[PDB]
Design a protein around this ligand. Structure first.
Ligand code: CLA
Ligand code: CLA
Ligand code: CLA
Ligand code: CLA
Ligand code: CLA
Ligand code: CLA
Ligand code: CLA
Ligand code: CLA
Ligand SMILES: CCCCCCCCCCCCCCCC(=O)OC[C@H](COP(=O)(O)OC[C@@H](O)CO)OC(=O)CCCCCCCCCCCCCCC
Ligand SMILES: CC1=C(/C=C/C(C)=C/C=C/C(C)=C/C=C/C=C(C)/C=C/C=C(C)/C=C/C2=C(C)CCCC2(C)C)C(C)(C)CCC1
Ligand code: SF4
Ligand code: SF4
Ligand code: SF4
Lengths: 742, 80, 141, 220, 146, 74
């Protein structure tokens, strides 16, 4: 039976364990003898399953940690709304969004730093923001600074609520293990309750507060004379003028005359020409349909009454001649291992973030977002990085599950067993695929570079030379462009302007979107992307599959998930643990995402973004140089890296001077990481031995004996600094370029 | 074949022998320590050189020393 | 002890894997681990996957000595089963390896003679110049 | 501008001598490895015990100090080239004002003088500077390839080579061909040497191409 | 040692590819070779120094020969401030026609490389003036190498 | 001129590293502690710690202050 199960006062609230560092583990609680202890305290802080073997005790800890994270997120949102209300030019940007740059940060006049308050327009000095909050606030119907202050106060109250909830559910009412393992109820509530009701409420807000205020805004009326949102609920007459169908009330809904609501519930496609974003009437209908779909979906599983499905029943009925018993045993694995669930959820969330990034640029949902290039580039890059990091974490935690929670004697599964019985075939095939893709993707660039350097432009792989046309993607584009006429007759326009419908949307003399052409250069970059993705997959999958054992190390599981090596024997056994494989795969994820964002930036600046005059002529930022220059490595070096870095390197003495400083700092940190990556701790411990002598000579030697960083810790520091420096270099370069020229 | 050597600073706690992944070391009677036993390496042809014994050595300095020497198919841990 | 010989005992139930013997067993050597089990039970394989050990005698062929010892220590620790293993050559020659004396090597036993024991501390090894242009190492003295 | 770069050169010299002298004076042994002389000049390590013993041999000190030598010599050569290229152009004030901060070095020396070199071949044609443009990217590629050997280590590659051996042994029409030497990954010390060689070759070729092309595009 | 390297029996018995890699990398470490003596060490070093000198002489002879054969030394000694010195000619089948045109510098009839080693100035300063002088210097250096 | 200066300086840089590498090899292979008792060469091994710590101090001071001045000017 599904019911609330709690335990009263399991852990006493006291400050006594705050004064004892390392209380959570047996080894660390004894106090430090060397400096390694100081690091070991921070590396094992959230490794709950290593603190205790009780599943219930671990689950309560993660449940409260989630509340803490939610409180932190609410504090962050409250700060964003408060800075929008108190230190921003939002109200001026509302009346002129095409000529005023959003800004919500103002610096103090100290040590000359007040130069960063640049001319963003609207009689305001500040730092231009690229988060896109202004367009979201305009879409939501927010018109005054007072409504942002109330949102900040509400977010503060909610953060306090989540913090209190975490304390209450760890110290007063701690749910039992059976409560957490009620997966059917959790799925039902998250599908129907959270998502369905949330989308239904947002749809209600859109049809009641967003649609009318945005209709007034798009009509060209002053924001300060638009009626307040509640005025559209009090006298329905105001709502019966923009849309006369509201005069009918809810009678059409209950009598199944839904076409009567076609005024504010539409299937249009394309973009709003005044706005440059998706029609709000389309978005409200989308959310209303998603609400019904999720509310019906959240009724699939059986909780307490007979109707519904059993997850174990579905899993045990899917087996075949090639897969033995099939999925039997997976319910036991996924209801007793936090790490497997974390791995699956991380992979799905990281994959979904990339889809969000891809969909937000091609279908701009927010008003005046498409013509704000700095916001678009920043959002795309940010979500790509988030997705890549989450995907890497998925592999890390799958390896952790394999090392710790895998047990064929009590939790056997045929599919996992059969995967482990032919891992050599999987890994060798992926190796061959990676080599083939690397050759037939990157060596074409080398061929083009050599042909260009040899004075033979006619022997290259180019649109004016040997062609490699992406015919399949071109066919998909043509099919999607013809959808409104044959395959989506009720739709008026295609789902995106990039499919090829031969139209361009211009807002404020700036190009929002237009059909994106695909040629040989795109054929090259797409296979480059596939190659890097395959190599990252190879590195991570090899670590997951070979974590327990290999022909080199028959007993790799006893060494743990995170160990440096197994000695210099067998020729050398460095970086054989599953942790190292994640450490190596982080670099390749970084490489892949960097290439993807470089591709996006160059393509958008060359073939989509630009300006349009009152003659009908389009002039792009880099003038369509992608097709003929992005086919050689020298082209990327010269026309992209050298040409577009001219902004960040001449930003000194302007409001963009903080990006050149961050450019240099990121370069410095990236170089700094190579000291940790290229060396080892045996040299550093010996070097420390001499400094300890100098300290002992002057009686200043500390009792906590200085130790060089551990073998694994040095790798972590090196990779963290490498990633930080690399990502910050592009952050500064992209922001400076797209703010100066965009 | 690598070289494994034992010095008389041994205290005979048998930590190296049970850390051997290829059964190279063993314990033999002795009279130089309270435990009346010392380690020996009669099967260094199966040594791989992982130096797991030295990680289990309590004496300072090490009482068991591994020197990496000529490489064979057994010492490189090759199964193909 | 007189080492035991190698019968034709059955093998654990296993579906097969790509981690088994290769051509090295055909031309150089392979290893055979034998034990006795009280009941049929699951055990993880050192080459990947899970197999079923039968009740009675059990014989398993592996590619390396390290695999045999890892499986043996796992059996001893988890199932409390005594084990043996042998080295088999392409010409059918069988060499008994472990437990060599009939007693596990971590337990002291009479009849064993020390090999590689240096009657000095590690700090008393001579300098390289004393062994220069000779074929001897400092630790071999 | 010269005062700061001379102290940078002094720092590079001092650090390189620190690494080399520490390696030479600790060659016979230390507190972490009292019997280092018993293992020779070049050995991989002493294993993961005693906290870890990566790069403990004296050869590894030289391997570490080569990077610092390259960095120091690059600093002095950058200084010489930038001080002379502005003097040959008739405007020393470009170096006098721009050498006092590092963004001046990045923009007015590297970025400014790479305009002609990277235009050796372009989608509109080529000129006589195309060899140096090709060698610039060649050095970049070799320098990047060295990072692979310097960052990734042996066990990952050995475990991957095992799978390739199985795949070859199970592929029809390829079983007829057998290797005579068993394929293994590069040794721990061998990989350091290979990565250092790639690093140094890329470092030398990139700067040689840049210097020759930048001084030959305009002839000072 | 029965195989390669023949100076290291321990490396010769290695059944892996490592036997090759290491054999190349320890060729000149005479002190660590099998059955080495001090007399053999000194004699081998003495012999190797002569080979190094021969290589040095051959390299200089090649430079002189190529400058005399494919260079523009005689035209350069008459206009050192306006003639680009030539190191050697270029014959690459991979070249395209624009590459052939672009690399025809100096007063040459085909693709050439412009020397940046300063050998022209050094040889002009020390009295060499004609191509025959470089030709007879190269022969003498080859004789010295032999 | 530029090519010659760069060429010779890089050659000198490599040679100077070789000088210390072979000096390190001498201490392992050829050094005889008993035949060098209390001469100028043994005292270096006697106060290697004092030498290394002072070199470390000099390098740390130079790096700290040069980088700080450069970043201040930037
Ligand atoms: C993620 C959320 C977030 C972030 C990044 C920021 C960031 C910022 N806010 Mg902000 N803010 C937030 C949430 C956030 N806020 C929320 C939720 C609210 C609503 C309560 C506000 C309300 C708010 C106001 C009203 C103001 C800012 C201001 C600022 C800016 C300067 C802050 C500063 O100097 O701190 C001030 C310094 C401190 C708080 C000290 C740090 C304290 C730590 C614990 C160290 C203590 C040591 C102490 C200083 C030493 C003396 C101790 C004593 C015993 C001797 C900065 C950009 C200011 C601004 O932009 O000015 C133009 C400003 O006036 N914020
Ligand atoms: C009301 C005050 C209070 C008090 C006295 C305690 C006391 C205790 N709690 Mg408890 N707890 C509280 C509130 C409190 N809690 C709240 C509000 C929550 C919900 C989040 C929890 C959730 C919680 C869990 C899940 C656990 C405890 C545990 C414990 C025990 C040891 C914890 C310890 O050493 O803390 C010292 C640790 C800290 C002070 C770290 C606080 C860090 C905060 C929460 C996060 C902020 C980080 C933020 C990102 C900073 C960013 C900036 C940075 C880059 C500089 C101890 C009995 C543990 C236990 O029972 O031990 C076995 C345990 O597992 N508590
Ligand atoms: C319709 C019911 C409902 C709803 C709305 C939620 C919503 C949520 N659950 Mg949840 N849950 C439910 C039923 C529900 N659950 C049931 C029945 C079970 C038992 C099977 C669980 C077991 C469960 C676990 C084990 C965990 C969650 C977590 C979460 C959060 C995921 C993070 C997120 O998306 O942030 C969205 C954020 C918001 C929408 C902000 C608003 C916050 C909402 C409104 C508070 C939810 C109140 C709750 C439904 C009832 C309060 C009790 C009452 C006495 C006050 C989210 C707030 C995770 C979490 O983060 O824990 C804190 C987590 O680890 N839930
Ligand atoms: C969760 C979302 C949500 C919420 C809270 C509301 C809330 C409201 N809607 Mg509503 N609405 C929504 C979604 C939502 N709507 C959607 C998705 C549609 C499109 C189908 C509509 C279409 C709609 C119309 C056409 C009308 C309302 C009206 C109303 C108001 C009175 C309803 C009432 O008591 O009579 C009906 C309630 C029951 C029969 C019970 C109320 C403020 C009415 C109003 O007064 O407008 C201001 C009105 O005429 N709504
Ligand atoms: C919701 C996601 C999530 C969750 C719950 C966890 C949870 C966990 N992970 Mg995990 N992980 C994640 C995502 C997640 N991870 C992702 C996305 C990756 C890929 C990068 C990883 C990679 C990873 C590895 C490789 C390992 C873990 C480990 C762990 C466990 C121990 C964590 C710990 O003690 O850290 C303690 C926290 C710290 C030491 C703080 C580190 C601070 C970081 C490095 C700095 C970040 C830079 C910052 C953003 C910039 C600041 C600038 C600065 C100037 C201020 C714990 C169960 C470890 C383990 O043993 O698992 C059992 C382990 O080895 N994870
Ligand atoms: C630019 C530097 C660089 C390059 C070229 C490579 C190249 C490679 N890495 Mg890699 N790597 C690097 C840096 C680099 N790495 C760094 C810095 C790290 C540390 C994070 C790693 C970490 C790493 C891991 C962890 C893995 C790789 C893998 C691979 C291979 C992928 C398969 C492939 O594309 O083969 C195609 C080969 C190329 C693209 C090389 C260029 C060849 C072109 C076409 C020219 C060839 C022309 C011709 C042959 C020349 C012959 C002339 C004759 C005179 C000799 C490939 C050999 C993976 C692997 O081995 O999978 C198979 C793998 O698992 N690397
Ligand atoms: C007069 C000069 C001189 C002499 C006589 C020696 C002599 C010796 N050195 Mg020595 N050395 C020197 C200078 C010298 N060195 C310098 C300047 C350095 C610093 C760079 C070193 C660093 C050094 C180290 C670190 C070691 C020696 C060792 C040795 C001994 C064995 C050498 C050996 O096995 O060669 C083998 C050498 C090779 C196989 C060369 C490898 C190939 C290199 C990397 C060049 C690659 C260039 C690349 C391919 C270019 C590509 C171009 C691109 C376009 C494709 C021997 C006694 C070794 C020894 O036994 O010490 C006890 C040893 O460990 N030396
Ligand atoms: C750009 C990269 C870089 C940098 C900055 C350094 C810096 C250093 N290396 Mg080094 N190294 C590098 C790359 C680098 N290395 C590489 C690639 C290798 C090859 C593997 C080596 C190999 C190497 C060896 C072998 C040795 C060094 C040594 C040193 C130190 C010399 C003393 C000195 O300059 O003091 C100046 C110190 C600095 C410039 C460090 C930066 C200090 C920052 C700027 C101040 C703090 C800022 C701020 C307050 C922190 C806030 C951040 C955070 C808290 C949020 C110094 C720390 C030597 C050493 O340890 O001597 C002491 C030594 O023996 N390195
Ligand atoms: C490709 C052909 C194909 O995908 O067939 C799909 C095939 C279907 O297997 P079964 O029908 O036996 O599986 C039944 C259940 O596991 C399905 O839930 O899967 C396999 O044969 C295992 C190898 C999959 C990976 C192959 C690469
Ligand atoms: C006359 C004159 C003057 C003076 C000058 C001088 C006096 C100079 C000096 C200089 C110097 C004085 C320099 C030095 C340098 C040194 C060095 C550079 C060293 C190095 C070392 C090493 C390298 C070592 C090695 C080794 C080892 C490590 C081990 C043992 C063995 C051996 C030794 C091998 C004046 C200015 C007044 C003025 C002008 C004129
Ligand atoms: S080397 Fe590895 S195997 Fe040989 S003895 Fe020491 S530990 Fe046991
Ligand atoms: S570990 Fe040290 S003590 Fe224990 S046996 Fe081996 S040598 Fe004797
Ligand atoms: S250095 Fe660290 S990793 Fe390399 S071998 Fe010695 S221990 Fe294993």
């Amino acid at each position: 039976e599904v019911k609330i199960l709690v335990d009263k006062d399991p852990v006493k609230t006291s400050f006594e364990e705050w004064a004892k560092p390392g209380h959570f583990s047996r080894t660390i609680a004894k106090g430090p003898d060397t400096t390694t202890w100081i690091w070991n305290l921070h590396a094992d802080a959230h490794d709950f399953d290593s603190h205790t073997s009780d599943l219930e005790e671990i689950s309560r800890k993660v449940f409260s940690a989630h509340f803490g994270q939610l409180s932190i997120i609410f504090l962050w949102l409250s700060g964003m709304y408060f800075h929008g209300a108190r230190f921003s030019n939002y109200e001026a940007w509302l009346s002129d969004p095409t000529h005023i740059g959003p800004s919500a940060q103002v610096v103090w006049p100290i040590v000359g730093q007040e130069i960063l308050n640049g001319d963003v327009g609207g009689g305001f000095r500040g730092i231009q923001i690229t988060s896109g909050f202004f367009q979201m606030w305009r879409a939501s119907g927010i018109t005054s600074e007072l409504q942002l202050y109330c949102t900040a106060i509400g977010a503060l109250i909610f953060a306090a609520l989540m913090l209190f909830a975490g304390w209450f559910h760890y110290h007063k009412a701690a749910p039992k293990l059976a409560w957490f393992q009620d997966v059917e109820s959790m799925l039902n509530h998250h599908l129907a309750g959270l998502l369905g009701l949330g989308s239904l409420g947002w749809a209600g807000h859109q049809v009641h507060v967003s649609l009318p205020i945005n209709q007034f805004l798009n009509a060209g009326v002053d924001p300060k004379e638009i009626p307040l949102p509640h005025e559209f609920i009090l006298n329905r007459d105001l709502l019966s003028q923009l849309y006369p169908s509201f005069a009918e009330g809810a009678t059409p809904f209950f009598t199944l005359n839904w076409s009567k609501y076609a005024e504010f519930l539409t299937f249009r496609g394309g973009l709003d020409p005044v706005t440059g974003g998706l029609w709000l009437t389309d978005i409200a209908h989308h959310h209303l349909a998603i609400a019904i779909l999720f509310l019906i979906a959240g009724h699939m599983y059986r909780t307490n009454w007979g109707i519904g499905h059993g997850l174990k029943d579905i899993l045990e009925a899917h087996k075949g001649p090639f897969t033995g018993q099939g999925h039997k045993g997976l319910y036991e694995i996924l209801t007793t291992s936090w790490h497997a669930q974390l791995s699956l959820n991380l992979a799905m969330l990281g994959s979904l973030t990339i889809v969000v990034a891809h969909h937000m640029y091609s279908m701009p949902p927010y008003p005046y977002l498409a013509t704000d290039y700095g916001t678009q580039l920043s959002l795309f890059t940010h979500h790509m990085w988030i997705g890549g990091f989450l995907i890497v974490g998925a592999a890390a935690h799958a390896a952790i599950f394999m090392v710790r929670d895998y047990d064929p004697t009590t939790r056997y599964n045929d599919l996992l067993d059969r995967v482990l019985r032919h891992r050599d075939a999987i890994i060798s095939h992926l190796n061959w695929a990676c080599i083939f893709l690397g050759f037939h993707s990157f060596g074409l660039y080398i061929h083009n570079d050599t042909m260009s350097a040899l004075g033979r432009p006619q022997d290259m792989f180019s649109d004016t030379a040997i062609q490699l046309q992406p015919v399949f993607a071109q066919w998909i584009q043509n099919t999607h462009a013809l959808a409104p006429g044959a395959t989506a007759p009720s739709a008026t326009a295609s789902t995106s302007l990039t499919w090829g419908g031969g139209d361009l949307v211009a807002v404020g003399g700036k190009v929002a979107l237009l059909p994106i052409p695909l040629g040989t250069a795109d054929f090259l970059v797409h296979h480059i992307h596939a190659f890097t993705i395959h190599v990252t997959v190879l590195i991570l999958l090899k670590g997951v599959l070979f974590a327990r054992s290999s022909r080199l190390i028959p007993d790799k599981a006893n060494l743990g998930f995170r160990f440096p090596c197994d000695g210099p024997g067998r020729g050398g056994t460095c970086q054989v643990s599953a942790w190292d494989h994640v450490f190596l795969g982080l670099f390749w994820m970084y490489n892949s995402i960097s290439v993807v964002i470089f591709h996006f930036s160059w393509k958008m600046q060359s073939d989509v973004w630009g300006s349009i005059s009152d003659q009908g002529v389009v002039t792009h930022i880099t003038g369509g140089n992608f097709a003929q220059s992005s086919i050689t490595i020298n082209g990327w070096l010269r026309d992209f890296l050298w040409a577009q870095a001219s902004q960040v390197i001449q930003s000194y003495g302007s409001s963009l001077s903080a990006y050149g400083l961050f450019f240099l700092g990121a370069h410095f940190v990236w170089a700094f990481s190579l000291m940790f990556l290229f060396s080892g701790r045996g040299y550093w411990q010996e070097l420390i031995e001499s400094i300890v002598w100098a300290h002992n000579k002057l009686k200043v030697a500390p009792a906590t004996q200085p130790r060089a960083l551990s073998i694994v810790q040095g790798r972590a520091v090196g990779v963290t600094h490498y990633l930080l420096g690399g990502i910050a270099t592009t952050w500064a370069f992209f922001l400076a370029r797209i703010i100066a020229v965009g | 074949s690598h070289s494994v050597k034992i010095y008389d600073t041994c205290i005979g706690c048998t930590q190296c022998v049970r850390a051997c992944p290829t059964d190279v070391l063993e314990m033999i009677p002795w009279d130089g320590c309270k435990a009346k036993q010392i380690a020996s390496a009669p099967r260094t042809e199966d040594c791989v050189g992982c130096k797991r014994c030295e990680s289990a050595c309590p004496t300072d300095f090490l009482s068991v020393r591994v020197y990496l020497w000529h490489e064979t198919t057994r010492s490189m841990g090759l199964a193909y | 002890t007189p080492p035991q010989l190698d019968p034709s005992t059955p093998s654990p139930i296993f579906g097969g894997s790509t981690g088994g013997l290769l051509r090295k067993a055909q031309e150089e050597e392979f290893y055979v681990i034998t034990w006795e089990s009280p009941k049929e039970q699951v055990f993880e394989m050192p080459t990947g996957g899970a197999a079923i050990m039968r009740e009675g005698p059990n014989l398993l062929k592996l590619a390396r000595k390290e695999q045999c010892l890892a499986l043996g220590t796992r059996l001893r620790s988890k199932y409390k089963i005594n084990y043996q293993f042998y080295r088999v050559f392409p010409n059918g020659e069988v060499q008994y390896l472990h437990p060599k004396d009939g007693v596990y090597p971590e337990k002291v036993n009479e009849g064993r003679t020390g090999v590689g024991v240096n009657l000095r501390s590690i700090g008393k090894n001579v300098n390289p110049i004393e062994v220069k242009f000779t074929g001897k190492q400092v630790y071999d003295l | 501008g010269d005062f700061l770069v001379h102290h940078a050169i002094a720092l590079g010299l001092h650090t390189t001598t620190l690494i080399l002298v520490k390696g030479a004076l600790d060659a016979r042994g230390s507190k972490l490895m009292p019997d280092k002389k018993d293992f020779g000049y070049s050995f991989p390590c002493d294993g993961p015990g005693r906290g870890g013993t990566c790069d403990i041999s004296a050869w590894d000190a030289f391997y570490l100090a080569v990077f610092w030598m390259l960095n120091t010599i690059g600093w002095v050569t950058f200084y010489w080239h930038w001080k002379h290229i502005t003097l040959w152009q008739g405007n020393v004030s470009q170096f006098n004002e721009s050498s006092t901060y590092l963004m001046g070095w990045l923009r007015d020396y590297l970025w400014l003088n790479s305009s002609q070199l990277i235009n050796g071949y372009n989608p509109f044609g080529m000129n006589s500077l195309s060899v140096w443009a090709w060698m610039f990217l060649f050095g970049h590629l070799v320098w990047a390839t060295g990072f692979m050997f310097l960052i990734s280590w042996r066990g990952y590659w050995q475990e991957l080579i095992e799978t390739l051996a199985w795949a070859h042994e199970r592929t029809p029409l390829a079983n007829l061909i057998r290797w005579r030497d068993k394929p293994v990954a590069l040794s721990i010390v061998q990989a350091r040497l290979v990565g250092l060689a790639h690093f140094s070759v890329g470092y030398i070729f990139t700067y040689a191409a840049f210097l020759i092309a930048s001084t030959s595009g305009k002839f000072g | 040692a029965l195989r390669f390297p023949r100076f290291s029996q321990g490396l010769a018995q290695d059944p892996t590819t490592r036997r090759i890699w290491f054999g190349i990398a320890t060729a000149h470490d005479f002190e660590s070779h099998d059955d080495i003596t001090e007399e053999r060490l000194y004699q081998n070093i003495f012999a190797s120094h002569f080979g190094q000198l021969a290589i040095i002489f051959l390299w200089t002879s090649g430079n002189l020969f190529h400058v005399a054969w494919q260079g523009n030394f005689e035209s350069w000694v008459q206009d050192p401030l306006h003639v680009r010195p030539i190191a050697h000619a270029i014959w690459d089948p991979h070249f395209g026609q624009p590459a052939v045109e672009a690399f025809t510098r100096g007063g040459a009839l085909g693709p050439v490389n412009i020397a940046y080693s300063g050998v022209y100035q050094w040889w002009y300063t020390i009295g060499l003036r004609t191509n025959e002088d470089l030709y007879t210097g190269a022969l003498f250096l080859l004789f010295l190498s032999a | 001129q530029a090519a010659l200066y760069t060429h010779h300086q890089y050659i000198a840089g490599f040679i100077m590293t070789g000088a210390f590498a072979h000096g390190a090899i001498f201490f392992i292979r050829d050094y005889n502690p008993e035949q060098n008792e209390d001469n100028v060469l043994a005292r270096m091994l006697d106060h290697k710690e004092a030498i290394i710590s002072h070199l470390s101090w000099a390098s740390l001071f130079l790096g700290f202050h040069t980088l700080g001045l450069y970043v201040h000017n930037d």
